[model samples]
Target: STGSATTTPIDSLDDAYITPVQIGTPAQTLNLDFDTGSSDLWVFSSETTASEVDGQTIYTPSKSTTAKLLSGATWSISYGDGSSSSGDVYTDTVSVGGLTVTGQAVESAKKVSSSFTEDSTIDGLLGLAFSTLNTVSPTQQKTFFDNAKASLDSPVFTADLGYHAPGTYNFGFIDTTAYTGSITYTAVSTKQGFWEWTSTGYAVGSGTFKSTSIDGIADTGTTLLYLPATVVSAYWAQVSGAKSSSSVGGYVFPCSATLPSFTFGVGSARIVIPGDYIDFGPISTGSSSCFGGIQSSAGIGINIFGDVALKAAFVVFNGATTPTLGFASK
Candidate 1:
């Protein structure tokens, strides 16, 4: 999704974490990530003097007369990818797409080095995933949904991302016409904020698994599924070659044939991973390796079921009902 600063290219994937909103009265526009993986709203500031990456855009609060900054508060963040950023925290009158909200908390990172910063198009990210993942204090929380829920006409939120359409991350109430069914629900185990899960078992191409047990977290913020080394190898066994190749980053094979479709059953729902998703490539080491959508994990304790798996099912995050997450399908 990264491009030169001059070109505001659209994201190919139909997903946008944070809905576009206005900041301050008579609102100034701000695009942020409504991440469920982590909490807190972060954006680059006009005060930043550092050189931006090729595709990054910097936010100018000077455009808005109502933007405010805390006198002395500072902030810093590091991602698992070994990228990091640091800066000052500011308070502002923020708005999303047109919905005005007051006293929103935002981090003004002065320095950003991660691939995320280089490729991002939005000014910042608004954490809508979980309160546990929030970085703000309980007394002065500023999460998008937490603050806007009261202002919304309906006590619901919907993410209507059209196929091939850049997702419209809407707040308020979800219109479940496309996914009205008996939803099988599950309670999420509390932790940092990501919706974590334990896979009872796994099967590949109708082959039986030696062990079906798996512990993992569901993340809408990420785009791929990460599994244990053994699990990856076992799953790849069903694929042609299944060789350990560096070209495609591991599980990729030459485009000799179409790979079989697979499904992942969580609780009572059977999720699908179409061949299009399994097809990956142009990674490194080899010319045509499988574009490894599933990578080997450092270990087994924590697995992440990212967007790759989420696309197969309709997800409903019901915090108002209770501290839990739910999954259903059409």
Candidate 2:
């Protein structure tokens, strides 16, 4: 589901969510998870401290002529994993594909931990996610999307997630060129800003799939996808030589060959996910790695499709449309 219209606030903890964009000549923008639940963008920057700025992509205003920040506001955030960063707010021109929007908001961290401060692959996050659940408040500002809606070239934005590889997630524009006929859409719910789903069946390999239908929610806030124990067991049973081991994390598995393709049939459309995602290594037990395709989440009440499932399909979150979600190709 998509989000509803709400006024932007001034509390840092409540309104400090900013979109992480590729800060350069033409910025690439994407709505991000501004998780008060966890802190740090996992990117690198010159302003970052020795410890807090690892494994992330940092944006330096000095390099970009389009970068700017709101006056008199300081930004700092800490995550639940003990990862954190401190930075200043700035704004600059941002571009996603052919769409360019100027005066985009951003936070540049100065102090950070080693885990987040050191990683180079990690780029800064664009946190359009809500912040009412965070630590600092009252001083926060509106999320990036809140600011963009008024000025962007288009009205709708969708996240095309790619794990282990890069995928295109668009902002302001929903590319309907790849879709056939009229795209079916799901209505946005106001409860908690999560994209909930109604799944019909999941396909593992080409034909091996369980007919057990399930209901779940999709969250960009989380890094891992969580499925029910029964779904996890049934999925692994089809893969040859797949075994659950302690060292491979809870649901990971190691096998002689690449696993088969997994697809989730939503409504009449089929979303295909690559098999390599199930090769989660050394998080479970023994020499076998956990299969990324499914994980046991017995205690967690809801099933969550993290970046993995999100990457397979182009999801349309329609605040304008009611009672349905639109699916298209990314």
Candidate 3:
């Protein structure tokens, strides 16, 4: 069987895409950020302290007859952005779209960092990365996708993200009508628990595509495209009024600057990021300064193809042996 779900951008931030998920027996629905960079299906729940909870909905496992506690099992997670959450574990029924996974491990947050508690809209995170990355102690837990893959018609999922618009996440099969041109396939290295790959090289504006190699991960949860500092400097050099601001962080430029398109090579295929998309938006409303959507990934250690870059292509997270990534123009 196959399933599909709609992904909506949150608050025009273009930073996160959230989808509805139903947890427990009677099904307590919550909006979760479908993150591909990590593994561990966690949620805001009754276990969370009331003082820490804001306007976000909480999942009460006691209300579901099927909820079973996993004795002594606990989970803790920390993101690259320094956000963290920890909680106890529960075995319950979890469903997304028309797909249901029985006895799925759901981590209910008991403690959350300000990063999570402050985000009033995001109920929690649903990890789609490999299950080996799960943080649960005593026993590692399987993700909803891993548990449901065997029953699916195809071991694949597609992400069709749009520009400031809604998109669809298709499971078990690929939708031919969602993309154009040929799909370019590339091998992925999951050694670090991420959809990591190497780009043959890149080019700024209309310049020649270099042969330099850059390693990075395709992270849906991250907001901007992050490249090496040297690479970022080269791109900004072409902009007339771009500067590296300590206060604003990274690189910022005048909103009216004539930005150039950037391209990255995957095998022989090249994915181009339009100039307009790189502008992000003004740093603040009514301000002439604009923050760049692409910045240095120096501290992060690896480049990240975040929403700023992924929105330009149709991506396929093929779960076959030696998991491969397929990209096509949208």
Question: Which candidate number has the best TM-score?
Answer: 3
Q: What is the TM-score of each candidate against the true structure?
A: 0.81, 0.68, 0.97
Q: What stretches of model 3 exceed 4 Å from their correct place?
A: none
lDDT on C-alpha atoms for all candidate structures:
0.59, 0.53, 0.90
Tell me the tens digit of each residue's lDDT in model 1 across 222-265: 55678888777876776776566664345666555466555666
**1 versus 2: better TM-score goes to:** 1
> How would you order the candidates by lDDT, starting with the best?
3, 1, 2
Residues 215-267 of candidate 3: C-alpha lDDT, one tens digit per residue: 99988888889999999999999999999888988899998897899998878
- Give the TM-score (vs. native) of candidate 3: 0.97
Q: Tell how far residue 233 is off in model 3, in angstroms.
A: 1.0
- Order of quality (TM-score): 3, 1, 2
The numbered model that scores best in lDDT is 3
Question: Can you tell me which runs of candidate 1 are displaced by over 4 Å?
Answer: 1-19, 120-122, 136-141, 152-164, 206-213, 245-250, 284-286, 299-301
Candidate 1, position 303, lDDT: 82
Give the higher-lDDT candidate: 2 or 3: 3
Q: For each predicted model, how many residue pairs clash, with residues at least 3 apart or on different chains?
A: 22, 71, 0
What is residue 281's positional error in candidate 2, in angstroms? 5.7
